[PDB]
Design a protein around this ligand. Structure first.
Ligand SMILES: Nc1ncnc2c1ncn2[C@@H]1O[C@H](CO)[C@@H](O)[C@H]1O
Ligand SMILES: [Mg+2]
Lengths: 309, 381, 361
């Protein structure tokens, strides 16, 4: 059982599962937690509960703490704002309080939606200006984390995909049914520019970063990472089709801005020099990662996924 | 949200049906220490004060059926009137004919070992699942370890009011995951067990929960809502063969996968490799385990079938429960390219002439340490 | 293609493990006629010239075990010592001890008329057809011990399974030493297989393993010992479905292992015939302290457009699965169990649990 200890919040979720695992299988003692339904694999915690959080930090004494749990769906934020702010910003705070009060290295996972996408590619120290509320809540997190912990690291990250359990876990993986039903025609956004990023890559950067900070206390502040294949939500759908040897034709590419899309940033691309400099980072090809991530939701496989023959 | 309960039960060394599986297998071992090529279909029957052997053995061994049978019963632990059965004084009856000559000249006589035909027809299955290290389904696994623990502590001294006869049922609450299953929590546990007259329920129940269950079932699956039913309907010394009947080969779901996957009716115990009911059922398990471990599927169901006198099996079929990225045809084609499931070959791969079968006759034949069939094969493809 | 194989087996009345299954239910019938509340658990053991009976009974009925055991062994057709066994000469030992949770499955499938998997129904029916041709006379060289295996090629498809064709057929059946090896195999093809397996499934490509043992003159108890409850998968869904472990024959209706198995099957065969799903498995979890099931899980293999949510709801209206109710509906005190003890339990029109309840939902 390794010496270094790492806490991974939101480990029930897509991104946290990968970080927990990358850290663990590269010789760390790694503890995951989440309210959602942590048990039996993880520890159960309500991040809004001060003591629940305080307890498992002061009983675990972690040197690195990665913070993935948050309200991520941009729509749900504008539906329930009282809560989204409470979890993205406040929890982040309390976590950052308890983090530096245990001498621990907080890595707050953030988001490209803190930018407006009017002048890409965006660098670490460029001027944030979100267009939507999720955009702003991930940003207010960054404050609440830095104001309560000099030497915590913010790590901004684009749209995520990866080895999901339910297609809704990623805005990439959802389109899948729309790609397999070659009979039904389906529209796809061709306006907004994206950079899909595999969470197992993100988890790699997350560990890579943390370890250097175990030697070098200058590792801190804000960082960008991102996969560098640039695609629309439509272009994704056709690489997914092609990756699985499927027709992408029933896919109509709509090129107009969505009717909510003056409040969704066009190309909020990240410049990953800051990290690339320190030689951090993994970039699994989309064409591969997405095929690794989706074959369990192939219909023919999906049919045979019962409990008994 | 698509989540289910499942239950597997297990019985312990001195449950009548499992004394017969044990004794029968003990008679198999007797013959194999002397004549490794023994033909054995020993079936045991156990009622009040009786052990009857019935069947067909053909072997150059010379075997003291009285000694063998009673040493098995002794080992199991019945040794006084008070306990309900006694090795020193039980009746032992031996009705053991030779192997039908028609079967021998249809199966193995005049044939090279490798080219031996199936010892009879039928279907076998092989199951495997990623839900546990041991690669078995958690229900049956826990079920067995509870009965194993009871013995350990009866035998090692640390709870010497115990007796051989026991029955554990483990209910688990599950979740589906892209074809695989996920043990979430233990819903219910039950432990009937035989004891002597000088203990109170409240002291046994306390012991069962803290010395056995708590030290077998990982804390992570237990919670404050997990039901325990320790000594369910009270006192229990009417146990073992007393007021009973017991037959070899009646606890086959328990011997195998606890009700998961599938079974083709094959009683294992009291049989040698030539009887595919057993050898191919191990081969099947080896196959499927080697595919889960190998890393191709996450859980898989295998089926072989043979016909009497025919080495190359008549059917082979894989069901990977939607869990592999490869097709089922692709896995089948691997299995053919890596295994060879004639009995004359399997005997060699899984070393099935060794007198160690009696181990198997309790606590399940699968998911267990040191068995040949449980050591996955590295696969070329 | 996206196809697969699936083998099931079945055994004739004379097969010694099944001999015992029958004699055990025979004893249960003898008691029920005199005492419907009689509580019975009877193991039967068969070997070269010996029928042994074992285990506890509680009843009012007094029963001539000599008579039961012999009239059954005659009906099966073991009549001369030329055959290995004879109802007239065999020993009958009796060792009965007489005074005065649960998890079961039911499975049904639309792949055949009887709502059983093709494989096992052809296995069953091949043996039944031998019993016929031995009893009528038309094949006089047959004897009562038999075993069929029927491997079918299948086509997975939107949940349910379509029998394409009959891949491999095994029949081994005990014969006399007058008839040559040929006349048999030839007759097995034309008199038996031809009569059972629908013309549409057979072809040049089909495989026949007929008397693959060469000789099969020694059989019945003489060839292999026989014990009650050693064909549980033959008795039910021959490779398909799922099984708890409950052997049936010899037990009476107070053991839910038997009773609920019929209830759970009834419930299934209702649903397939009633259109609510093409294929189905009914898991019925009984609890200690609860006379009702604690849980019912309904895997319909995606062959339904109604949710599993829904189907569970249709069951709790239409059925009543506490033991005390099932004994009533299926009438399980009627001494009729010896007719279940061969040729499968689930899949014949005769039985209470095989007439699909009209589902008002
Ligand atoms: N010589 C034989 N050839 C083929 N099958 C047999 C033979 N003898 C017995 N059997 C059948 O197979 C079983 C034992 O292998 C018996 O119960 C019987 O039904
Ligand atoms: Mg058997």
């Amino acid at each position: 059982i390794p010496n270094r200890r790492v806490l991974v919040t939101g480990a029930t979720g897509l991104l946290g599962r990968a970080v927990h695992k990358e850290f663990q299988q590269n010789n760390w003692h790694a503890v995951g937690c989440g309210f959602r339904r942590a048990r039996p694999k993880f520890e159960q915690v309500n991040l809004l509960d001060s003591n629940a959080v305080h307890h498992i930090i002061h009983d675990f004494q972690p040197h690195v703490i990665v913070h993935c749990a948050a309200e991520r769906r941009p729509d749900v934020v504008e539906n329930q704002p009282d809560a989204a702010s409470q979890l993205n910003v406040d929890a982040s705070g309390n976590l950052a309080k308890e983090a530096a009060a245990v001498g621990a290295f907080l890595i707050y996972i953030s988001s490209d939606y803190v930018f407006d996408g009017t002048n890409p590619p965006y660098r670490e120290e460029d001027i944030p200006a979100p267009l939507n509320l999720y955009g702003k809540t991930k940003l207010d997190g960054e404050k609440a984390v830095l104001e309560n912990n000099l030497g915590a690291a913010v790590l901004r990250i684009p749209i995520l995909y990866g080895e999901v359990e339910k297609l809704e876990e990623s805005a990439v993986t959802v389109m899948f049914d729309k790609v397999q039903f070659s009979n039904k025609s389906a529209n796809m956004d061709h306006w907004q520019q994206r950079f899909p990023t595999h969470v197992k890559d993100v988890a790699t950067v997350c560990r890579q970063l943390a370890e250097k900070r175990m030697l070098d206390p200058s590792i801190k502040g804000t960082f960008h990472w991102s996969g560098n294949e640039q695609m629309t939500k439509y272009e994704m759908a056709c690489a997914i089709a092609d990756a699985f040897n499927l027709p992408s034709s029933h896919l109509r590419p709509i090129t107009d801005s969505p009717v909510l899309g003056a409040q969704r940033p066009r190309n909020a691309q990240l410049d990953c020099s800051k990290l690339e400099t320190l030689g951090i980072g993994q970039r699994t090809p989309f064409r591969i990662g997405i095929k690794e991530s989706l074959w369990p939701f192939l219909i023919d496989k999906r049919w045979r996924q019962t409990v008994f023959h | 949200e698509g989540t289910f309960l499942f239950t597997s039960e297990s019985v312990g060394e001195g449950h009548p049906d499992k004394i017969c599986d044990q004794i029968s297998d003990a008679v198999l071992d007797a013959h194999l220490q002397q004549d490794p090529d023994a033909k054995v279909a020993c079936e045991t029957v156990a009622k009040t004060g009786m052990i009857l052997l019935a069947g067909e053995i053909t072997s150059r061994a010379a075997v003291d059926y009285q000694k063998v049978v009673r040493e098995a019963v002794k080992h199991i632990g019945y040794d006084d009137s008070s306990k309900g059965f006694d090795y020193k004084t039980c009746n032992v009856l031996v009705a053991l004919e030779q192997q039908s000559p028609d079967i021998a000249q249809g199966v193995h006589l005049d044939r090279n070992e490798e080219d031996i035909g199936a010892g009879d027809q039928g279907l076998m299955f092989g199951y495997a699942t990623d839900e546990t290290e041991e690669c078995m389904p958690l229900t049956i696994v826990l079920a067995h370890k509870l009965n194993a623990k009871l013995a350990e502590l009866r035998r090692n001294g640390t709870l010497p009011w115990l007796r051989p006869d026991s029955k554990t049922q483990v209910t688990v609450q599950y979740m589906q995951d892209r074809g695989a299953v996920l043990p979430i929590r233990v819903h219910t546990i039950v432990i009937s067990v035989q004891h002597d007259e000088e203990v109170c329920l409240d002291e046994m129940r306390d012991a069962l929960k803290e010395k056995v269950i708590k030290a077998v079932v990982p804390a992570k699956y237990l919670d404050e809502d997990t039901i325990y039913h320790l000594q369910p309907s009270g006192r229990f010394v009417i146990g073992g063969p007393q007021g009973d009947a017991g037959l070899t080969g009646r606890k086959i779901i328990v011997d195998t996968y606890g009700g998961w996957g599938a079974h083709g009716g094959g009683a294992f115990s009291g049989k040698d490799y030539t009887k595919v009911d057993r050898s191919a059922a191990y081969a099947a398990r080896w196959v499927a385990k080697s595919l889960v471990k190998g890393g191709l599927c996450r859980r898989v169901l295998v089926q072989v079938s043979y016909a009497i006198g025919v080495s190359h099996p008549l059917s082979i079929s894989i069901f990977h429960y939607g869990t592999s990225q490869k097709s089922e045809r692709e896995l089948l084609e691997i299995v053919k390219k890596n295994f060879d499931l004639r009995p004359g070959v399997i005997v060699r791969d899984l070393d099935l002439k060794k007198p160690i079968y009696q181990r198997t006759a309790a606590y399940g034949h699968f998911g267990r340490d040191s068995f040949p069939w449980e050591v996955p094969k590295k696969l070329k493809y």
